[PDB]
């Protein structure tokens, strides 16, 4: 329930920590939580996740810092319609993803 | 947990910003490293960098910026001395690794003077 208020054109830059010894090479994803608590994946790493390589999907950039146990997420050139609830997960189909810890709320205004 | 990449430093004119940027020693000890400012609509801009290769401990001084690369544990120390209001901004430590994009070390620094 951390909430970040940003303006159009700005960048959200966050770090999601995970247990290095368990999840460093696990595939990971950034999701928006839509109506009815229904997650939608907007960007994911490769399987296995590559250390450091920036993965850019649309305006989202993922960078997995294997040596520090965190996934960095950037949402660049923000738009009002990016506003919502987001989370990092460990992406492991065909099982349901493992939520890493928490969700955040992003609010983008003009 | 999920947190902002930046860490906020609120300081007064005349004081010194003194931060550490940890890195993986066995990968990056000799790599050239830099302190950059992140301005809106521009590429990150290096204000000071180590030599290539980076020397153990010897300070590099550019204006009021002091860089020190400690090879005992793999840590880049950055100071900005005699701080001015105009120093306020968003900064990062990076490791150069051409032809890849520079690799950012955590945490970014949100400086408010």
Swiss-Prot record, chain A:
Disulfide bonds join 16-88. Glycosylated. It comes from the Eukaryota. Residues 1-109 form the Ig-like V-type domain. Induction: Up-regulated by bacteria, fungi and bacterial lipopolysaccharides (LPS). Mostly expressed by immune cells of the myeloid lineage, such as monocytes, macrophages, neutrophils and dendritic cells. Expression is associated with a mature stage of myeloid development. Highly expressed in adult liver, lung and spleen than in corresponding fetal tissue. Also expressed in the lymph node, placenta, spinal cord and heart tissues. Isoform 2 was detected in the lung, liver and mature monocytes. Monomer. Homomultimer; when activated. Interacts with TYROBP/DAP12. Interacts with TLR4. This is Triggering receptor expressed on myeloid cells 1. It comes from Homo sapiens. The gene is TREM1. The chain holds residues 26 to 135 of 234 of the full protein.
